[PDB]
Design a protein around this ligand. Structure first.
Ligand SMILES: *[C@@H]1O[C@H](CO)[C@@H](O[C@@H]2O[C@H](CO)[C@@H](O[C@@H]3O[C@H](CO[C@@H]4O[C@H](CO)[C@@H](O[C@H]5O[C@H](CO)[C@@H](O)[C@H](O)[C@@H]5O)[C@H](O)[C@@H]4O)[C@@H](O)[C@H](O[C@H]4O[C@H](CO)[C@@H](O)[C@H](O)[C@@H]4O)[C@@H]3O)[C@H](O)[C@H]2NC(C)=O)[C@H](O)[C@H]1NC(C)=O
Ligand SMILES: *[C@@H]1O[C@H](CO)[C@@H](O[C@@H]2O[C@H](CO)[C@@H](O[C@@H]3O[C@H](CO)[C@@H](O)[C@H](O)[C@@H]3O)[C@H](O)[C@H]2NC(C)=O)[C@H](O)[C@H]1NC(C)=O
Ligand SMILES: *[C@@H]1O[C@H](CO)[C@@H](O[C@@H]2O[C@H](CO)[C@@H](O[C@@H]3O[C@H](CO)[C@@H](O)[C@H](O)[C@@H]3O)[C@H](O)[C@H]2NC(C)=O)[C@H](O)[C@H]1NC(C)=O
Ligand SMILES: *[C@@H]1O[C@H](CO)[C@@H](O[C@@H]2O[C@H](CO)[C@@H](O)[C@H](O)[C@H]2NC(C)=O)[C@H](O)[C@H]1NC(C)=O
Ligand SMILES: *[C@@H]1O[C@H](CO)[C@@H](O[C@@H]2O[C@H](CO)[C@@H](O)[C@H](O)[C@H]2NC(C)=O)[C@H](O)[C@H]1NC(C)=O
Ligand SMILES: *[C@@H]1O[C@H](CO)[C@@H](O[C@@H]2O[C@H](CO)[C@@H](O)[C@H](O)[C@H]2NC(C)=O)[C@H](O)[C@H]1NC(C)=O
Ligand SMILES: *[C@@H]1O[C@H](CO)[C@@H](O[C@@H]2O[C@H](CO)[C@@H](O)[C@H](O)[C@H]2NC(C)=O)[C@H](O)[C@H]1NC(C)=O
Ligand SMILES: *[C@@H]1O[C@H](CO)[C@@H](O)[C@H](O)[C@H]1NC(C)=O
Ligand SMILES: *[C@@H]1O[C@H](CO)[C@@H](O)[C@H](O)[C@H]1NC(C)=O
Ligand SMILES: [Ca+2]
Ligand SMILES: [Ca+2]
Ligand SMILES: [Ca+2]
Ligand SMILES: [Ca+2]
Ligand SMILES: [Ca+2]
Ligand SMILES: [Ca+2]
Ligand SMILES: [Ca+2]
Ligand SMILES: [Mg+2]
Lengths: 49, 737, 465
């Protein structure tokens, strides 16, 4: 399987800095590290909400 | 080109109320009275606890020109609870967009903030107040339950609105779905029938609405400007919306189906941040029954003379075809920092020529940055790229630019004379101006002249006072007028006839009228519209054949006509205009019969010769010197023939030899003009073919410088003819002894 | 034979010297009466005049100190002091040089986007500020640096106007503390205190608005036009580093918020260091931005993140003279842009003359980098650091004044160093210092005898009274 990750397009991890969830409005884009297939939350975005 | 500018009608609103921000006409179906609808988005209303809540006024046209507000909404902020306002009408900008069908008025408030039904918020959903003469309803299409920034919370519905001919409302909110934009189409009947004041989120049927898209389309501002026109097979009007920030801020225009809101075509700008889609229009400009898209980019920058970009603005004209093809052309601006394509207002057939016209306004152009409105007339090929009229603002800025031309309306005849009018709204001074088109009178002038060749010998004419029996010819002139719309039956015309045109440089006049005995003759004509020719016969007689300077230049007939301009309408003195592209003067040519071969031009051959008969003169004495000159023209007629003897600084002329019959008595003169003294002698006018002249000229020579060794003359014959008018220069030398 | 000296200067020393630079005088009594007293020096020797009796002072340029122009105090005009000697109606030529060795003066202003989209790029923006200050201090010594901030126009729908507790803290909905929103906040005027700049830059924090486009063009325009507030120096090279990570609001975008007044062009920053007309005036258009930048001689530089590099490169193509960098963990791109901007810094040398007397006149021959002597020009453009230029100057004097001493200064504009002269008009013979008062030697007459010749008073028109 390849899990169809938001940053794990196909099965190989994408390059660090790729945007998995484009920020809407004056917000911070969600980036992917390149070692986890999920779309991790931006660290300094809020109260970890 | 016929819009009246000397006496327009101005409407003034409350100071600082942005009066005239959005203008429109009123065309009630149940009454014959025509009103002007003008928006005042920052005016003060009597609503309780509402400051600068905006208002929409209706201003009469022939009744004291007074403006009275329309009571769309006389209530204040509704309360959701004990102390919990539900809506916020303060600074709501009501009246920022005014549209009007026959009996319906749609005035929208883009910035109306409404507290949601779920949480205490302030969201500029925007509301629209539809009025059907008696029943005034509130139409807020995007005040729904999906309230957030992600949805229609910041819809600002009513930013741009339009009416389709099938009784449908086109509404544009540039803020819906994170400023992606939205178009909402609801039937007027459904809006009126579904109104219920106790419920705020009303769901209408037959609603066409654009849906949310991906996050890459955010901040596109779809619905910033909406137009309505038909762009496919069916007769249902399609929706044209401006998307000025789309395609990485290039600009775009979206055309959606008018039956199920499906995208059909797309326009895209060429320059970033040019704001391509600020104002759009859909009118048929070439008159083949196919609507054409006009897209404004007021911030367009184009290269100038030195290659530096200048912000002039641009308007793109896209001509529809039988297929989906569009023949797009560009109409560049005229002044830097003027925002040319700011407002586009289709005037309809302004001059009633067959093809609709259009007006594009630069609100920050002209002198003192007041405002300029251009008028371009549509043609069969397309849109004329040269404006045929310039409208200037006449109110200086107080604290904000006047913005004359920020919003106009057209294609509505308000004085019932058959020509569409134009309201121009300058909100920087809180003014609204109504320009009424003048009737266009076309004139088919005619000037029939007798045969161009005039025979001087043919003198079978009579004269008053002396009866000199000289040649004469007749000139016939007449004109017709016919224009559409209201126009008086009899139009006063005055025609001036000028004889020997293109020669009024202080010279003499050769052709002269028989009776008036003047080169100029003016007559007054009272002609009828759509009538036949009304031609008067005038007789002109030429002067003596040996009186005028030359008989080479053709005699020109000039007839200039001017409308009386006192045939004005009884309403406000609206004087009719003459057609712009037709000439106001007719010129015909006449020639003086002169035997000049088959090519109709006289081409002479001029020869000159001279002998010495002395061959030597002595230095110390004043020696009588006679030169025998032979001047012959073996070609055709030479007009104004004279021989030029350019004597040197030494000798001077004495006289012609008359003691012998072998030589002639030529009339001779001493000339000194233009740095050179010379002797001229008349050779005959004209100088007939094969004529051989022989005469002698007496002189007196006294040497200047003691080492000169020769006396050199120069002989040359010249004529006023156009080709072969000069003889070869012959130089005769006399040796000093 | 006869010459100008023999017809004009035959009176005495002062007028003989005043006639022509080459005129010479003889103060020998052995010369018989009739022979010219003012003539050529060679001619004077031919007439057998005593060389000790020949008064032929030649105009000369006597340099006093000639330390060479320094290279990379510093010396920038050589010579710096000339003793100049002119007889009346004479010209003398000397050569000066201007070598721009002093560092270019530079002004850098830093525009920081402090929106909530920049909470991740805050460290990058502060690191770029510190690296910029360090790099420009390394490149040039005369450096002034400051900074500012911008979020967007504080009006709805950009702002958070509800709940009322979110007017003082827009991140209430996110349950975090962020500073109230502002249009443009000028923080630090242009100062040479890099430590203060670093402190105030590190003391910054983000704000929050609603939509992704920011009001950075308003901040650019205000930083451009508020000359006195920012602190732009008249004779300096201005650089404006603009930072952002999202799209930019363009003109006519304020109609949504209800602003329909075009950007007038003036400066609206008040005594509170805030853009006062943020809520009443629209965003500035690219044409106006271009016009103001060219008028104020400001080099805009876009230091934007990776995701808007192409967008702002196209904007820069629409704004001539603008370069775009990339904002990242390292500031190498924008630092190279700054270094290149310093590299295309071109200096000009406009020679100026102060307290120039009426009598003296000067002629300039500018020998610029093309080595082509151009008469009538005195200002060579295009000079760089370590670049050397020269000027040929010939001083002409009309007659001689009674001052007997004057000094004037030659100086390149914008240069600390200068050349100063000490013009001492001869205007007389040395032997007139030993002149005889009246009569006595000059026979029984009562005129005056000096330098071997006598010139009587009124009435006595004779050679020797
Ligand atoms: C004039 O210009 C206009 C502006 O460019 C044109 O309008 C645009 O037309 C596009 C088609 O040409 C259209 O793209 C289609 O978008 C819909 C949107 O539905 C989506 O539904 C998803 C689930 O809710 C969400 O996005 C998913 O998919 C995207 C990738 O597209 C992912 O990134 C997301 O993470 C998510 O998984 C969204 O909610 C969104 O609403 C799509 O369904 C369409 O998919 C179809 O085409 C693709 C190939 O592209 C097929 O693989 C697929 O199977 C479908 O057949 C399209 O992507 C734009 O939305 C639309 N935008 C606007 C603003 O109108 C207009 O077409 C043009 N006219 C002419 C005549 O050229
Ligand atoms: C519509 O009516 C409202 C009534 O409130 C007008 O608003 C008021 O306008 C005046 C100016 O004419 C404001 O006075 C100002 O006060 C501030 C201090 O608060 C001062 O700094 C200014 O120099 C000026 O004197 C007044 O505050 C304001 N009332 C408010 C905001 O509640 C409004 O001008 C009217 N609009 C039109 C188009 O007539
Ligand atoms: C000599 O000059 C006289 C002018 O006094 C000429 O008389 C006019 O000549 C014109 C044409 O050159 C003719 O006009 C004709 O009038 C009839 C109606 O009678 C009309 O049907 C024709 O279409 C044409 O317009 C006519 O002969 C005469 N007209 C008048 C008003 O006098 C005469 O022809 C000249 N002769 C020569 C040999 O050039
Ligand atoms: C909306 O209306 C349009 C035309 O009115 C529809 O487009 C046509 O759909 C039929 C059936 O799918 C096709 O045979 C035609 O070729 C289409 N015409 C075109 C593409 O020009 C469309 O299907 C309707 N519904 C939507 C867009 O959801
Ligand atoms: C006569 O008519 C002509 C044109 O029909 C006018 O004179 C100018 O003609 C040129 C070329 O057609 C136009 O470009 C000019 O605009 C015309 N001048 C003006 C003032 O419009 C004019 O109507 C008449 N001229 C004269 C001398 O009678
Ligand atoms: C910046 O400009 C470049 C071109 O100058 C844009 O690249 C073009 O993008 C369009 C997108 O439809 C393509 O069709 C072209 O082929 C591209 N050209 C080149 C040379 O790459 C780029 O998209 C622009 N950036 C933004 C953000 O709009
Ligand atoms: C500037 O340059 C010009 C030309 O190179 C100089 O003119 C020359 O001057 C010398 C000395 O008087 C003459 O011998 C030449 O005949 C002149 N040439 C010409 C073409 O005029 C001029 O003297 C220079 N001026 C200074 C101040 O250096
Ligand atoms: C023609 O009318 C004008 C003004 O209407 C008048 O001045 C002129 O005298 C009239 N001429 C004739 C011949 O009727
Ligand atoms: C002055 O100009 C002359 C050329 O006529 C040149 O020979 C001389 O060197 C110049 N003076 C100086 C100080 O170089
Ligand atoms: Ca249709
Ligand atoms: Ca058409
Ligand atoms: Ca027309
Ligand atoms: Ca009318
Ligand atoms: Ca011929
Ligand atoms: Ca970011
Ligand atoms: Ca913003
Ligand atoms: Mg942001």
């Amino acid at each position: 399987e390849c899990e169809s990750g938001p940053c794990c397009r196909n099965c190989k991890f994408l390059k660090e800095g790729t945007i998995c969830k484009r920020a809407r409005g004056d917000d911070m884009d969600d980036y992917c590290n390149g070692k986890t297939c999920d779309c991790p939350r931006n660290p300094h975005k809020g109260p970890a909400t | 080109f016929n819009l009246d500018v000397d006496s327009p009608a101005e409407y003034s609103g409350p100071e600082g109320s942005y009066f005239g921000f959005a203008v429109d006409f009123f065309v009630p179906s149940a009454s014959s009275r025509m009103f002007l609808l003008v928006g005042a988005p920052k005016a003060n209303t009597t609503q309780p606890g509402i400051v600068e809540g905006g208002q929409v006024l209706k201003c009469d046209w022939s009744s004291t020109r007074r403006c009275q507000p329309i009571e769309f909404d006389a209530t204040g902020n509704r309360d959701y609870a004990k102390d919990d306002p539900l809506e916020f009408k303060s600074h709501q900008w009501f009246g920022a967009s005014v549209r009007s069908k026959q009996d319906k008025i749609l005035a929208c408030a883009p910035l109306y903030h409404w507290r949601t039904e779920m949480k205490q918020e302030r969201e500029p959903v925007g509301t629209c107040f539809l009025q059907d003469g008696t029943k005034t309803v509130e139409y807020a299409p995007c005040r729904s339950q999906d309230i957030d920034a992600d949805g229609q919370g910041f819809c600002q519905g009513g930013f741009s609105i339009d009416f389709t001919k099938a009784d449908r409302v086109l509404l544009g909110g540039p803020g819906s779905f994170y400023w992606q934009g939205q178009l909402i189409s609801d039937q007027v009947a459904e809006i009126v029938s579904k109104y219920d004041p106790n419920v705020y989120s009303i769901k209408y049927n037959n609603q066409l609405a654009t849906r949310t898209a991906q996050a890459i389309f955010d901040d596109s501002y779809l619905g910033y400007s909406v137009a309505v026109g038909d762009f496919n097979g069916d007769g249902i009007d399609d929706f044209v919306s401006g998307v000025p920030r789309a395609a990485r801020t290039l600009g775009m225009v979206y055309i959606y189906d008018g039956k199920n809101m499906s995208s059909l075509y797309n326009f895209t700008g060429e320059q970033m941040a040019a704001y391509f889609g600020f104002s759009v229009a859909a009118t048929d400009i070439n008159g083949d029954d196919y609507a054409d898209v006009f897209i404004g980019a007021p911030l367009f920058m184009d290269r100038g003379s030195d290659g530096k970009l200048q912000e002039v603005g641009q308007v793109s004209v896209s001509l529809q075809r039988a297929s989906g093809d569009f023949q797009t052309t560009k109409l560049n601006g005229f002044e830097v920092f003027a925002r040319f394509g700011s407002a586009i207002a289709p005037l309809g057939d302004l001059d009633q020529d067959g093809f609709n016209d259009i007006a594009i306004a630069a609100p920050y152009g002209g002198e003192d940055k007041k405002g300029i409105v251009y008028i371009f007339n549509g043609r069969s090929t397309g849109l004329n790229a040269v404006p045929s009229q310039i409208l200037e603002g006449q109110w200086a800025a107080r604290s904000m630019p006047p913005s004359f031309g920020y919003s106009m309306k057209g294609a509505t005849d308000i004085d019932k004379n058959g020509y569409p009018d134009l309201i121009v709204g300058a909100f920087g001074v809180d003014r609204a101006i109504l320009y009424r088109a003048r009737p266009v009178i076309t004139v088919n002038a005619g000037l029939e002249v007798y045969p161009s060749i005039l025979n001087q010998d043919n003198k079978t004419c009579s004269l008053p006072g002396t009866a000199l029996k000289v040649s004469c010819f007749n000139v016939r002139f007449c004109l017709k007028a016919d224009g559409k719309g209201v126009l008086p039956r009899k139009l006063n015309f005055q025609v001036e006839l000028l004889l020997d045109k293109l020669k009024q440089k202080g010279a003499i006049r050769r052709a002269l009228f028989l009776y008036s005995r003047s080169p100029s003759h003016s007559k007054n004509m009272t002609i009828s519209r759509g009538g036949l020719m009304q031609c008067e016969e005038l007789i002109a007689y030429l002067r003596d054949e040996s009186e005028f300077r030359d008989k080479l230049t053709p005699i020109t007939i000039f007839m200039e006509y001017r409308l009386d301009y006192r045939t004005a309408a009884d309403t406000t003195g609206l004087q009719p205009i003459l057609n712009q592209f037709t000439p106001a003067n007719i010129s015909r040519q006449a020639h003086i019969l002169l035997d000049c071969g088959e090519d109709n031009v006289c081409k002479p051959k001029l020869e000159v010769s001279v002998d010495s008969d002395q061959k030597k003169i002595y230095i110390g004495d004043d020696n009588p010197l006679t030169l025998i000159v032979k001047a012959q023209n073996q070609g055709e007629g030479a007009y104004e023939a004279e021989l030029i003897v350019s004597i040197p600084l030494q000798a001077d002329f004495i006289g012609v030899v008359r003691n012998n019959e072998a030589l002639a008595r030529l009339s001779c003169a001493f000339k000194t003009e233009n740095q050179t003294r010379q002797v001229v002698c008349d050779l005959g006018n004209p100088m007939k073919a094969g004529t051989q002249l022989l005469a002698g000229l007496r002189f007196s020579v006294h040497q200047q410088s003691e080492m000169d060794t020769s006396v050199k003359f120069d002989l040359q014959i010249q004529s006023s003819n156009l080709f072969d008018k000069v003889s070869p220069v012959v130089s005769h030398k006399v040796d000093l002894a | 034979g006869p010459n100008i000296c023999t017809t004009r200067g035959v009176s005495s020393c002062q007028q003989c010297l005043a006639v022509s630079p080459m005129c010479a005088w003889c103060s020998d009594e052995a010369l018989p009466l009739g022979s010219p007293r003012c003539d050529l020096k060679e001619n004077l020797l031919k007439d057998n005049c005593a060389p000790e009796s020949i008064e032929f002072p030649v105009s000369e340029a006597r340099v006093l100190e000639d330390r060479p122009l320094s290279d990379k105090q510093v010396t920038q005009v050589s010579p710096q002091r000339i003793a100049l000697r002119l007889r009346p109606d004479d010209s003398k030529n000397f050569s000066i040089q201007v070598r721009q060795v002093e560092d270019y003066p530079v002004d850098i202003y830093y525009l920081m986007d402090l929106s909530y989209s920049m909470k991740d790029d805050l460290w990058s923006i502060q690191n770029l500020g510190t690296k910029l200050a360090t790099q420009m201090r390394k490149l040039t010594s005369n450096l002034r640096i400051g900074f500012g901030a911008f979020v967007d126009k504080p009006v709805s729908p950009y702002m958070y106007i509800s709940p009322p507790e979110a007017l003082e803290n827009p991140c209430y909905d996110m349950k975090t503390t962020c500073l109230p929103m502002f249009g443009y906040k000028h923080v630090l005027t242009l100062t040479d205190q890099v430590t203060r700049f670093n402190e105030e830059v590190k003391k910054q924090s983000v704000s929050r608005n609603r939509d992704a486009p920011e009001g950075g063009f308003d901040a650019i325009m205000q930083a451009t036009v508020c000359d006195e507030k920012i602190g732009w120096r008249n004779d300096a090279s201005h650089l404006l580093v603009f930072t952002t990570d999202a799209k930019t609001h363009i003109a006519l975008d304020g109609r949504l918020a209800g602003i329909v007044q075009p950007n007038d062009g003036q400066c609206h920053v008040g005594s509170d260091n805030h853009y006062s007309a943020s809520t009443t005036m629209d965003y500035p258009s690219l044409g106006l931005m271009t016009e103001k930048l060219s008028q104020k001689n400001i080099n805009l530089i876009f230091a934007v993140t990776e995701n808007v590099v192409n967008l702002y490169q196209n904007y820069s193509e629409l704004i001539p003279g603008t370069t775009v960098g990339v904002l990242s963990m390292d500031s190498s791109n924008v630092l190279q842009l700054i270094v290149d901007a310093y590299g295309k810094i071109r200096s000009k040398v406009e020679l100026e003359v102060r307290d120039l007397p009426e009598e003296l006149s000067l002629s300039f021959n500018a020998t610029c980098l093309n080595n082509e002597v151009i008469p009538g020009l005195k200002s060579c453009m295009g000079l760089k650091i370590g670049d050397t230029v020269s000027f040929s100057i010939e001083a002409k004097v009309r007659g001689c004044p009674q001052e007997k001493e004057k000094s004037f200064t030659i100086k390149p504009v914008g240069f600390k160093d200068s050349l100063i002269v000490q013009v001492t008009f001869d205007c007389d013979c040395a032997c007139q210092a030993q002149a005889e008062p009246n009569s006595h030697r000059c026979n029984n007459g009562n005129g005056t005898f000096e330098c071997g010749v006598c010139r009587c008073g009124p009435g006595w028109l004779g050679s020797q009274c």
